[PDB]
Amino acid sequence: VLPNPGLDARIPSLAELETIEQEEASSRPKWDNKAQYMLTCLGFCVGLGNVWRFPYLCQSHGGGAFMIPFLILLVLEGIPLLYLEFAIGQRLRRGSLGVWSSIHPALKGLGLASMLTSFMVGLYYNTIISWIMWYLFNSFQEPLPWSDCPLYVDECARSSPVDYFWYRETLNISTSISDSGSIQWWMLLCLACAWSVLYMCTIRGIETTGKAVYITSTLPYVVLTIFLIRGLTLKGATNGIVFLFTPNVTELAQPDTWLDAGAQVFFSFSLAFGGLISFSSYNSVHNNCEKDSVIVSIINGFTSVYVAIVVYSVIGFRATQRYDDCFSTNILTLINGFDLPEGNVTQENFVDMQQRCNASDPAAYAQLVFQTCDINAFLSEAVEGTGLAFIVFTEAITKMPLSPLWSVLFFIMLFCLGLSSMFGNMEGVVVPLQDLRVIPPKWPKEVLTGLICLGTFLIGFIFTLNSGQYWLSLLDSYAGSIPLLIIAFCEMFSVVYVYGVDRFNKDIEFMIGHKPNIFWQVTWRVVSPLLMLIIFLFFFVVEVSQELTYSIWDPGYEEFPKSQKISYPNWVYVVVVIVAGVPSLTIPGYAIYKLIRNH
Amino acid sequence: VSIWLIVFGVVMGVIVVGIVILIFTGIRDR
Numbered sequence: 001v002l003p004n005p006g007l008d009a010r011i012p013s014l015a016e017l018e019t020i021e022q023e024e025a026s027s028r029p030k031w032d033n034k035a036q037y038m039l040t041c042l043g044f045c046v047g048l049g050n051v052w053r054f055p056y057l058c059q060s061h062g063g064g065a066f067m068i069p070f071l072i073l074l075v076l077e078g079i080p081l082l083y084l085e086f087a088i089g090q091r092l093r094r095g096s097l098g099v100w101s102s103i104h105p106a107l108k109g110l111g112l113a114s115m116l117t118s119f120m121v122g123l124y125y126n127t128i129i130s131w132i133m134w135y136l137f138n139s140f141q142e143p144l145p146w147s148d149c150p151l152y153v154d155e156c157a158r159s160s161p162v163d164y165f166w167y168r169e170t171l172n173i174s175t176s177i178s179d180s181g182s183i184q185w186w187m188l189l190c191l192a193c194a195w196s197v198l199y200m201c202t203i204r205g206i207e208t209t210g211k212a213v214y215i216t217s218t219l220p221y222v223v224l225t226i227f228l229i230r231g232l233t234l235k236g237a238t239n240g241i242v243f244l245f246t247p248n249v250t251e252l253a254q255p256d257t258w259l260d261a262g263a264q265v266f267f268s269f270s271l272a273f274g275g276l277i278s279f280s281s282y283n284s285v286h287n288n289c290e291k292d293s294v295i296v297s298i299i300n301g302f303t304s305v306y307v308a309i310v311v312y313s314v315i316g317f318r319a320t321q322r323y324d325d326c327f328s329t330n331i332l333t334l335i336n337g338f339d340l341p342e343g344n345v346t347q348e349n350f351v352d353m354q355q356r357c358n359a360s361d362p363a364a365y366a367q368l369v370f371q372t373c374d375i376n377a378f379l380s381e382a383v384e385g386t387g388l389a390f391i392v393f394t395e396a397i398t399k400m401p402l403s404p405l406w407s408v409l410f411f412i413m414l415f416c417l418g419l420s421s422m423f424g425n426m427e428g429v430v431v432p433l434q435d436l437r438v439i440p441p442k443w444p445k446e447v448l449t450g451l452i453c454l455g456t457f458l459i460g461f462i463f464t465l466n467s468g469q470y471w472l473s474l475l476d477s478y479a480g481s482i483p484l485l486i487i488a489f490c491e492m493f494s495v496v497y498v499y500g501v502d503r504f505n506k507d508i509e510f511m512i513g514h515k516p517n518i519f520w521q522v523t524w525r526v527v528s529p530l531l532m533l534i535i536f537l538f539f540f541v542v543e544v545s546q547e548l549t550y551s552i553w554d555p556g557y558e559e560f561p562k563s564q565k566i567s568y569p570n571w572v573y574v575v576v577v578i579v580a581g582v583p584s585l586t587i588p589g590y591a592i593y594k595l596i597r598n599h
Numbered sequence: 600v601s602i603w604l605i606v607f608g609v610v611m612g613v614i615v616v617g618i619v620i621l622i623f624t625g626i627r628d629r
C-alpha cells in the first residue's frame with residue numbers, strides 16, 4: 001500500500017523459487033528432518049521464563065483469571081505474528097536483516113534492533129546458565145552444600161542456609177549497585193564453561209545445534225514429567241496447585257495484568273528476535289508453515305501451564321513442610337512450658353490445650369511465645385525469577401529422600417531449557433553479522449561463532465562482580481520491555497503496509513497451495529497492530545507508575561532476613577536508555593539516515 | 600577437594616574434547 005518501488009527486485013520471484021532450492025543445496029544449510037526444525041523452535045520458545053516467570057504471573061494476576069488474557073494475546077498476537085515470521089523467512093530465503101532490508105532498504109533498522117536485542121538477552125541468559133551449572137556441579141554431596149549453616153555464621157543463622165549459599169557462598173553479593181568488587185573466580189570458571197558448552201553446540205550452525213536441540217528439547221519434558229509424578233506424592237502438593245488456580249476476577253480489570261500477559265506471550269514465543277525467521281528460511285519452499293505455527297503455539301500454551309503445575313506442586317510441599325514445622329515448634333513450646341505428656345497435645349487439640357494451660361497457669365502461659373502459622377502465608381512466599389530456582393526449589397529438594405538425585409535432575413533440566421533458548425539467541429546474533437559480511441568470507445563460520453562466544457564472554461565479566469546480580473536484575477528488567485514489542489509492531493507493519501499482505505497471502509498461496517483464512521488477514525491488519533499499541537501505551541502507564549527501586553541483601557543493617565530494598569543512583573537512567581532507547585531508536589534512526597543520504 | 604571443582608574439571612574436559620573434534624572436522628572438509 002505504501003509506494004516502495006524496486007521492491008520486486010529485492011525479493012526473488014515465485015517462478016524462480018522452484019529452481020533456487022536445487023542450487024542453494026550448496027552455500028546454504030538445510031534441516032535433516034522436519035522433527036529437527038520443530039524441536040529447535042520448541043526449544044527457542046521454552047526456557048527458564050516459563051519456569052520462574054509464567055507460573056508466578058499466572059497466580060499473582062488473578063490466578064485462574066490471568067489465563068484468560070494470556071490465551072487472548074496468545075491467539076490474537078502470538079500465533080498471528082509467529083505465522084508472519086515463519087512465512088516471511090520461508091519466502092524471502094534470508095535471515096532477519098536480509099528480510100527487512102529487502103521489504104525496504106530503510107527497514108535495515110529492524111534487523112539491527114533484532115540483532116541488538118538478541119545480543120543483550122543472550123548476554124544475561126548465559127550468566128543465568130552459568131549459575132545453573134554452578135549448582136549442578138555442587139549437586140554431588142549427600143548433604144547438599146545448601147543444607148546446613150557454616151559453623152554458625154550469624155548472617156547464615158538468620159534466614160536459612162539456602163538463602164546463605166546463594167547470596168554469600170555463590171554470589172558474595174554486595175549491599176548496592178554502587179558496590180562492585182573482584183571477579184568471583186569460581187563464577188568466572190562457570191561463565192567460561194557456559195560459553196564453551198554453547199560454542200560446541202553452535203560452532204558450525206543449525207547443523208550442529210540440530211543434533212543438540214533434540215536432547216535440549218527432549219530431556220526437559222522427560223525430567224519435568226518425572227518431577228510431576230514425584231511432586232504429586234509429596235504431602236501438600238495439591239494445596240499449592242489449588243493455590244495457583246484460585247481465580248481473582250478483580251485482577252482482570254487492571255492495566256498491569258494485560259501488559260505482563262502481553263510481554264509474556266512475546267518473550268515465550270521468541271518473537272522480534274529474528275532467530276525464528278532464520279530457522280524457517282532453511283525449510284523447503286513448499287513446507288506448510290501455517291500448520292507449523294499452530295502446532296508450536298499449541299505446545300507452548302500446554303507447556304506454560306504444565307510447568308506451572310510442576311512448580312506449584314513443589315511450592316505446596318515446601319509450604320506444607322514450613323507450616324507443619326512451625327506448628328510443631330508451637331506445640332513443643334506448650335509441652336515444655338507445662339511439662340504436658342508428649343502426644344497428649346496434638347495439631348487438632350492444640351488450641352483447647354493452649355486455653356486449658358493458660359487457665360491453669362496464666363503467668364507461665366504469658367511467658368510462653370507462639371509463632372503465627374498460616375499455610376496461605378507460606379504459600380504466598382513464592383519467589384519470581386532466579387529466587388524460585390536457587391532459593392525455593394533448592395530448599396524443597398533438601399526435604400526429599402534421594403535429595404542429591406532430585407537436585408541433579410532439576411539442574412540438568414534448567415540447563416537444557418536455557419541452552420535451547422541460547423541456540424535461538426545465537427542464531428539471532430551470528431546470521432545478521434554474515435548479512436553485514438563482518439566475518440571475512442575467508443574465515444570459516446566457526447571463527448565468527450568463536451569470536452561472538454569470546455566477545456560476549458568478556459562483557460559477561462560485569463555479572464561476576466560482587467554487584468553482578470544487581471546489574472543482571474536491571475538488564476533483565478529492561479531487555480524484553482517495549483523494544484521487543486516495538487520491533488514486533490514494525491515487523492507486522494512492514495509485511496502489511498510496505499510489502500503488502502496481498503503479496504504475502506499470494507506467496508502463502510504459492511507455498512501451501514492455498515491462501516490464509518480471514519482470521520490471519522484480520523489479525524495482521526487490526527487485531528495485532530491495535531492490541532500491541534494498547535500494550536505499548538500500558539508500558540508508559542505502568543513503567544511511569546513505578547520507580548527505579550531494587551532490593552538488596554545487606555547481611556547486616558535493618559533485618560537481615562527482611563528483604564531490604566533501596567532506590568537506584570541518578571546515572572542508571574543512562575543504562576536504561578542504552579537497554580531501551582538504543583534498541584528502539586535504530587528503527588527510526590537508520591530510516592532518517594537513509595532518507596537523507598539519497599536526498 | 601570441593602567436589603564441585605572436580606565436576607567442573609570433568610565437564611570442561613568433555614566440552615574441550617567436543618569443540619576440538621568439531622574444529623578438526625572444520626579443517627577436515629576435503
Ligand SMILES: *[C@@H]1O[C@H](CO)[C@@H](O[C@@H]2O[C@H](CO)[C@@H](O)[C@H](O)[C@H]2NC(C)=O)[C@H](O)[C@H]1NC(C)=O
Pocket residue numbers: 247248249250251
Ligand atoms: C482480588 O484481589 C484484590 C486485591 O486484594 C481485591 O481487591 C480488594 O478488595 C477489598 C474489598 O473491596 C478491598 O478492601 C481491598 O482494599 C482491595 N485490594 C486492593 C489492592 O484493591 C479483590 O476484591 C479480589 N477479588 C477477587 C475476585 O478475588
Ligand SMILES: *[C@@H]1O[C@H](CO)[C@@H](O)[C@H](O)[C@H]1NC(C)=O
Pocket residue numbers: 171172173174175179181466
Ligand atoms: C567477596 O568475597 C571476599 C572474600 O573472598 C570479601 O572480602 C568481600 O567483602 C566479598 N564481597 C561482597 C560484596 O560480598
